[PDB]
Design a binder for this molecule. Structure first.
Ligand code: NAP
Ligand code: SF4
Ligand code: SF4
Ligand code: ZN
Lengths: 123, 306, 114, 208, 176, 71, 385, 111
């Protein structure tokens, strides 16, 4: 069998060059591009790294660049394995929080009052 | 103004202009200038094919080629009207069958001490030699020091660079040795008196320019190039045959690119370890290269293994 | 750890293996320097060998070092034969690369904090 | 329902519901999940303790020949707490039937390779080492195929970005073709394409 | 089904060996067969004298890019960006702006003729049918710095000819 | 600054401009309410769009159509 | 032992495939080739594209097949999307799907007969091959690489013509295949150049996972062409060749009879085509017509959105393979549920067909080894799977 | 016949009893396994199904029907490996229950 149970926090290295200690990741929730109202693009945690300089390429004006990562987003399942991926390869990060709104109390019929203020007109 | 890493495809602010740049010295200098990235403007004389091996150093849009004679004025003016700095390294050995060869070190550095200077350039740098003195030797060695003073009237602050003898890959002085497969290998001239001069290494030459190109404050304060440790011996000629174990010419051959049994043979055997009060290389640091490590590379003869 | 190892068990089949192939590199550095027809001094090669082993000495867990053993041994397969045509061996030395500044006042004049 | 809709059949959906059922019945040691695809495919989820004998059981029989090893692949899945996913695909010659073997693993935990069981896995098994680092056990010759000699990346996983770090260039500084940090002329503009409003009713998630 | 080719046992009798003995010894093979099938030289050489003669094509042949416009010049492009989002090599780059008359037009317009992989989807994505793969293979400049086409090549290149372009669309638009 | 890259290269530039070439059109008129604009011909050109012409006698070139349309 | 690397040599054939030879004096007994001259980053690259946009990178995977590739892709996608293609469209995928086999099986003999060193059967057949690229240009878009098969069936209808052309073409082709019969079959030297070479016939000839020819022509009768359907492909009549023993000369003689089958199928397919439509009608996958995307309102919103993003594919793994004219063609297309696919691992031939060069080579000469390779018909860039 | 169709084998030599040993060769080794797994319940089922139709009737060609293998010399190989299969069923133990259940959410596809 050769099970040999032991314990160590798995920090793997050698596969990148230097950008372990240089950068800091970010875990957050994408929340409702507000030109419309589709809520399908919630429920999945994503990541994005540091943004570095974008200069002008002096022949066209293209957005040529250094900063070799700059485009890496993965699709996470939840907050639980969100941390566990950033530590398993081991570079710094910072975590946001999921925002869910009010439930909330909305009821038609109270928009026509005898003495209240909740009263609509000009419909 | 600069932007980002200067690995490749950067801007780095500077816009230079290097004349000549087809020989051993002028090519290898520009091969650093297209690495950090800039608008390198190199005009060549009469050679479309002889710059083909030059292009894969500047990435894209960084180099540009123009045509010029030198005795004409505006061809040396139309190109240089938009730049920041400009260096020059133009010149060669023996007198042409058509040229004049005296004023080429006099009026041709003056032809770019023209409106070129007036146009608004700065940090204009010319080349010198360590042995170019006003003394009566030689026909080529002197008449180089004439340009060191008579053209120094113009450009009152330049930091004209003064190199010693250089050794690299495809020069003339070190390849003058071991191209002497002959019925007798004689030194110059069967005497170990003055040998040798200061063979500075070619990486130190191109490193001195790029530190000085935005140093700052290096105008007028002319500089000298230190060689190796320390003077050198007669052993060098024996050092050749020991370890060696004893470009637009023509379509068939050039009739005269000779060994020149004339004042060529004395322009190197006139050493002149000159004044050490010039700053001139270690202060424009950092340049420190021996001889014994770079000698395997340039020498190439029939054994090649042992 | 409910996972079986590769070769070693705990640190003592491990640390004798990193010492082991070090001699195989150590007789290799003078052997290849005349073979691949490149011209540096041979002691620089022996400095760069121990450069690579000493840097990763911050490991306190087995089967990662053992994973580097498989990486370290596979390097010798191309090395003893001729499978790196005069470039990959020169790729170890960051030679013509411009120097990184690594100094705070030096970084501040050039760059948007890279 | 109409034309221009794929006509499914039930005969192959019946026997593949029938055949794979008594497979878990006769080895309840390694099999942990069996599922039938809605278009006549079969998955047999296997913990990799039985990586050799279940193949060795499908290596030979009288009711299951299955001696045509077609496809060894490798699929990474982050956010699973065991990342990778080795997936086989084998073919019965006499019966015209496809079945796949899904075996998960992790990075450092090795896998007993199929070298005596099949000899078509000679170049396939090495590929997962070169691309992921999944060290298979007891292979006679582990080497480097389909990558360049100086990489340290195992690129087909997700943390390796689109370009590497190793944009190559030439200089006449001496002779060499030297490496350099990577520099592009253009960003590879990354779009944003996922429209909202959930076009699929059947695969609806547990709403938590 | 089956077929068993190259599966035939020999004759092995008195007379039929003389057909296999005259074959090897006097070479009735290899000359009647292979010396006659080569000659066969008297046929006409089907060669195109390329600087003078040219070969056939099709009306749907792809090639050089160009831009069209309406009757008297209007810039048929409307800069609706759809050709950009389907270019597989992302050879398109467009920056638009409201021109002072009010209708939107383009400012930069690029086709990376190096990167351009000629999927031609730009021709099948424009609603107002702006960009057209013009059928002329005239090319081969001398620098990498030249083939990046800006806008003022393409309107000029779309106006070196139009009757070449305008007849091919008008003979093919019924199919697609 | 950029003016050095074309020395002896003659700067191949466009001649005509469509910045203002709408303005030389004989701006159309109908005297109705709503008009089709399948201009340039049917099944080509800009798609069908309907414009109200009541207010400073014009339409506004339809955006798509480009030709000045009015009453 | 001498360790020559006769490969990178641009000695005709295909200057690539650099390998080693630890030859035992004259015999080889050890061959360990190297691959990876074109890795190109293919399977990583598709992970950022959409379904319609990624499609020509299947086309450039061979050198030869233009309609047999993308046949293994749309049929690998239409199963996920619950679509049968319309019936006029299926008669064209069999027509061009049985015309690319008349491009491999011409190139698979001549290029093999050039490494060998014969000059004249290289020029005697490519001059007839020119009569066939005029088809490709007339129907789709270009010389070879045509993004023509879509997931929504055929792109567009082939124009007026191409039915008195193909019948004109195919009625004068069997004389050209009767040429090479006189050139190679009855000849002795080429027979003496290849008999009993590469005798691989055991059950390790199938345990190595080979696909067709370097199968059934060596023995075991099996193919994907009448045990597994594609489209209207079983409603035509043909037979499949089998050679006698397990050498190269009894996998060569598959390809002469194989070209004598594609002429029958084309002359059988033309009689059976009905008039009809091109695309799938429900237009959540096919784009609508050009005369429609300029009139109505419903046409543009199901046009303008269908190019910004792609389709909507349901999740769940899938797999299929078809008959490439040199083998199987595995595609294990992992779907995720958006316009952009997940992992797309491909199996091409040559993984099996060239790893088994170790078994096939030894005990033989060095001049045998170049004659081995042009029999499996191995094309690089296709070993990038 | 002199060629067996499938190239690589040889008609070697006698049908009807080379098989009849090798079925009975398995059935004696079949009794050695402890009977709790249903491996015996189906393998002894099909061998008794086979050997009843095997033993012992003319001709070779009739034995091809009602015995769905290739040619009769290849039907040896259908059970040749099966003898090598069942003897390794004693070595490892599939009749033991499940081991290493996965951690409770792994075989869910949509991430
Ligand atoms: N530092 C040293 O040790 C050393 C040693 C010897 C000489 N030098 C001098 O320092 C510089 C080093 O040159 P190098 O070693 O690279 O060899 P080089 O071949 O002389 O390079 C200098 C360039 O000047 C060009 N040239 C010569 N006459 C010209 C003229 N009338 N007009 C325009 N160009 C002319 C030459 O050929 P093109 O006309 O084709 O451009 C050449 O490209 C030269 O000035 C040389 O005289 C220095
Ligand atoms: S072709 Fe279409 S998408 Fe491209 S610039 Fe013209 S209008 Fe815009
Ligand atoms: S021509 Fe080809 S590469 Fe260029 S934009 Fe159109 S589809 Fe893209
Ligand atoms: Zn209009």
């Amino acid at each position: 069998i050769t099970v040999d149970e032991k314990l160590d926090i798995t920090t793997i290295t050698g596969v990148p060059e230097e950008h372990i200690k240089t950068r800091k990741a970010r875990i957050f929730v994408p929340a409702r591009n507000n030109m419309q109202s589709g809520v399908n693009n919630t429920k999945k945690w994503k990541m994005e790294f540091d943004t570095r300089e974008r200069w002008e390429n002096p022949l066209m004006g293209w957005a040529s660049t250094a900063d070799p990562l700059s485009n890496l987003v993965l699709t996470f399942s939840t907050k639980e394995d969100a941390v566990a991926f950033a530590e398993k390869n081991g570079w710094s990060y910072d975590v946001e929080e999921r925002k869910v709104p009010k439930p909330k109390s909305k009821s038609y019929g109270a928009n026509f009052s005898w003495n209240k203020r909740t009263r609509v007109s000009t419909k | 103004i600069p932007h980002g890493k200067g690995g490749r495809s950067s801007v780095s602010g500077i816009v230079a202009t290097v004349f000549g740049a087809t020989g051993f010295l002028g090519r290898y200098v520009v091969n650093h200038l297209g690495r950090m990235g800039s608008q390198v403007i190199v005009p060549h004389r009469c050679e479309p094919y002889d710059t083909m091996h030059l292009r894969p150093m500047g990435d894209l849009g960084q180099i540009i080629f123009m045509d010029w004679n030198g005795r004409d004025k505006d061809s040396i003016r139309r190109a240089v009207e938009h730049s920041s700095v400009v260096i020059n390294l133009v010149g060669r050995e023996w007198e042409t069958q058509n040229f004049d060869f005296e004023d080429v070190f006099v009026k041709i550095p003056q032809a770019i001490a023209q409106v070129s200077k007036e146009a608004g350039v700065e940090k204009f740098i010319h080349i010198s030699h360590l042995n170019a003195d006003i003394k009566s030797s030689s026909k080529y060695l002197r008449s180089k020091a004439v340009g060191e003073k008579e053209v120094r009237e113009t450009f009152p602050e330049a930091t004209i660079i003064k190199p010693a003898e250089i050794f690299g890959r495809e020069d003339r002085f070190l390849n003058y040795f071991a191209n002497i497969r002959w019925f007798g290998g004689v030194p110059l001239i069967s005497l170990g008196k003055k040998t040798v001069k200061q063979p500075v290494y070619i990486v130190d030459v191109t490193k001195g320019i790029i530190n000085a190109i935005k140093d700052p404050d290096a105008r007028g304060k002319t500089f000298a190039f230190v060689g190796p440790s320390r003077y050198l011996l007669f052993d060098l000629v024996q050092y050749v045959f020991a370890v060696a174990h004893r470009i637009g010419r023509l379509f068939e051959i050039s009739p005269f690119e000779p060994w020149t049994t004339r004042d060529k043979v004395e322009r190197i055997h006139t050493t002149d370890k000159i004044l050490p009060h010039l700053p001139g290389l270690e202060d424009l640091g950092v340049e420190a290269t021996p001889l014994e490590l770079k000698a395997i590379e340039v020498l190439r003869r029939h054994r090649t293994y042992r | 750890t409910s996972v079986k190892p590769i070769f070693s068990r705990d640190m003592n089949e491990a640390k004798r293996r990193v010492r082991e192939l070090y001699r195989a590199w150590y007789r290799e550095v003078p052997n290849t320097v005349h073979l691949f027809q490149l011209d540096i001094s041979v002691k620089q090669g022996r400095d760069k060998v121990r450069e690579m082993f000493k840097k990763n000495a911050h490991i306190t867990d087995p089967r990662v070092v053992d994973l580097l053993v498989i990486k370290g041994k596979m390097e010798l397969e191309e090395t003893i034969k001729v499978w790196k045509q005069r470039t990959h061996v020169m790729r170890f030395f960051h030679e013509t690369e411009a120097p990184r500044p690594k100094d705070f006042l030096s970084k501040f004049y050039v760059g948007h904090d890279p | 329902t109409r034309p221009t809709v794929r006509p499914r059949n039930d005969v192959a959906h019946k026997q593949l519901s029938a055949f794979g059922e008594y497979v878990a019945e006769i080895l309840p040691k390694y099999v942990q999940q069996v599922q039938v695809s809605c278009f006549n495919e079969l998955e047999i989820c296997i913990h990799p303790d039985g990586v050799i004998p279940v193949l060795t059981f499908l290596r030979d029989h009288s009711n299951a020949q299955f001696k045509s090893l077609a496809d060894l692949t490798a699929v990474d899945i982050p956010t699973r707490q065991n990342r990778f996913e080795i997936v086989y695909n084998l073919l019965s010659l006499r019966f015209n039937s496809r079945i796949r073997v899904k075996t998960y693993t992790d990075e450092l935990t090795p896998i007993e390779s199929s070298v005596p069981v099949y000899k078509a896995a000679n170049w396939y098994e090495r590929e997962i080492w070169d691309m992921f680092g999944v060290f298979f056990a007891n292979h006679p010759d582990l080497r480097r195929i389909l990558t360049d000699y100086g990489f340290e990346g195992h690129p087909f996983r997700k943390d390796f970005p689109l370009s590497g770090y190793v944009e190559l260039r030439y200089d006449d500084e001496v002779k060499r073709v030297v490496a350099e940090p990577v520099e592009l002329a253009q960003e590879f503009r990354k779009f944003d394409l996922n429209s909202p409003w959930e076009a699929f009713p059947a695969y609806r998630q547990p709403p938590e | 089904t089956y077929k068993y080719v190259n599966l035939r046992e020999p004759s092995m009798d008195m007379k039929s060996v003389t057909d296999r003995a005259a074959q090897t010894l006097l070479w009735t093979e290899l000359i009647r067969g292979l010396g006659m099938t080569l000659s066969y030289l008297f046929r006409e050489p089907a060669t195109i004298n390329y600087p003078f003669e040219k070969g056939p094509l099709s009306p749907r042949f792809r090639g050089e890019h160009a831009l069209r416009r309406y009757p008297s010049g209007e810039e048929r492009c409307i800069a609706c960006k759809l050709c950009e989002a389907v270019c597989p090599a992302q050879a398109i780059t467009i920056e638009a702006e409201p021109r002072a008359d009010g209708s939107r037009r383009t400012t930069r317009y690029d086709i990376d003729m190096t990167k351009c992989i000629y999927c031609g989807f730009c021709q099948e994505a424009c609603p107002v049918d702006a960009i057209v793969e013009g059928p002329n293979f005239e090319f081969s400049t001398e620098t990498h710095e030249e083939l990046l086409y800006n806008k003022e090549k393409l309107l000029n290149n779309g106006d070196k000819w139009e009757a070449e372009i305008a007849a091919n669309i008008q003979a093919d638009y019924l199919y697609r | 600054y950029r003016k050095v890259r074309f020395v002896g290269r003659q700067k191949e530039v466009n001649e005509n401009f469509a910045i203002d070439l709408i303005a030389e059109q004989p701006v159309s008129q109908v005297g109705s309410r709503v008009i089709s604009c399948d201009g340039g011909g049917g099944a080509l050109g800009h798609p069908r769009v309907y414009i109200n012409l009541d207010k400073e006698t014009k339409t506004g070139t339809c955006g798509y159509c480009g030709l000045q349309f009015r009453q | 032992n001498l360790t020559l690397n006769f490969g990178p040599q641009h000695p005709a054939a295909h200057g690539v495939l650099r390998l080693v030879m630890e030859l035992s004096g004259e015999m080889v007994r050890k061959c360990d080739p190297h691959i990876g001259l074109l890795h190109r980053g293919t399977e990583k690259l598709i992970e950022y594209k959409t379904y319609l946009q990624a499609l020509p990178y299947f086309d450039r995977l061979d050198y030869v097949s233009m309609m047999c590739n993308e046949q293994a892709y749309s049929l690998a996608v239409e199963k996920l999307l619950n679509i049968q293609p319309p019936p006029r469209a299926q008669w064209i995928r069999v027509l061009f799907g049985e015309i690319t086999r008349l491009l491999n099986h011409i190139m698979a003999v001549t290029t093999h007969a050039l490494d060998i060193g014969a000059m004249t059967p290289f020029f005697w057949m490519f001059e007839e091959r020119e009569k066939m690229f005029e088809f490709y240009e007339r129907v789709s878009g270009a010389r070879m690489h045509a993004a023509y098969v879509r997931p929504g069936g055929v792109h567009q209808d082939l124009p007026l013509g191409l039915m008195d052309d193909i019948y004109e073409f195919s009625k004068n082709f069997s004389l050209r295949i009767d040429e090479l019969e006189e050139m190679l079959t009855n000849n002795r030297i080429w027979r003496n150049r290849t008999v009993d070479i590469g005798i691989v016939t055991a059950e390790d000839a199938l345990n190595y996972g080979f696909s067709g020819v370097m199968l059934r022509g060596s023995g075991i009768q099996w193919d994907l062409r009448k045990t597994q359907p594609y489209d209207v492909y079983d409603q035509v009549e043909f037979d499949v060749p089998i050679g006698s023993r397990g050498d190269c000369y009894d996998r060569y003689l598959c390809r002469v009879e194989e070209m004598r089958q594609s002429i029958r199928i084309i002359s059988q397919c033309l009689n059976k085509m009905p008039p009809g439509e091109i695309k799938v009608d429900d237009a959540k996958v096919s784009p609508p017509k050009r005369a429609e995307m300029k009139t109505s309102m419903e046409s543009l919103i199901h046009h303008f959105k269908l190019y910004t993003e792609g389709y909507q594919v349901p999740p769940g793994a899938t797999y299929t393979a078809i008959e490439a004219p040199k083998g199987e063609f595995g595609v294990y297309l992992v779907s995720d549920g958006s316009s952009r696919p997940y992992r797309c691992k491909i199996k091409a031939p040559g993984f099996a067909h060239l790893a088994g060069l170790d078994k096939m080579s030894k005990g033989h000469m060095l001049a045998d080894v170049v004659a081995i390779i042009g029999t499996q018909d191995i094309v690089f860039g296709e070993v990038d799977r | 016949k002199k060629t067996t169709g499938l190239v690589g084998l040889a008609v070697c030599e006698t049908p009807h009893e080379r098989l009849k040993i090798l079925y009975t060769k398995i059935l004696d080794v079949l009794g050695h396994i402890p009977k709790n797994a249903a491996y015996r319940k189906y393998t002894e089922q099909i061998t008794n199904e086979k050997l009843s139709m095997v033993k012992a009737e003319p001709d070779v060609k009739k034995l091809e029907e009602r015995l769905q293998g290739g040619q009769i010399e290849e039907v040896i190989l259908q059970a040749e490996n099966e003898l090598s299969l069942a003897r390794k069923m004693i070595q490892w133990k599939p009749w033991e229950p499940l081991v290493e259940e996965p951690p409770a959410s792994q075989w869910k596809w949509p991430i």
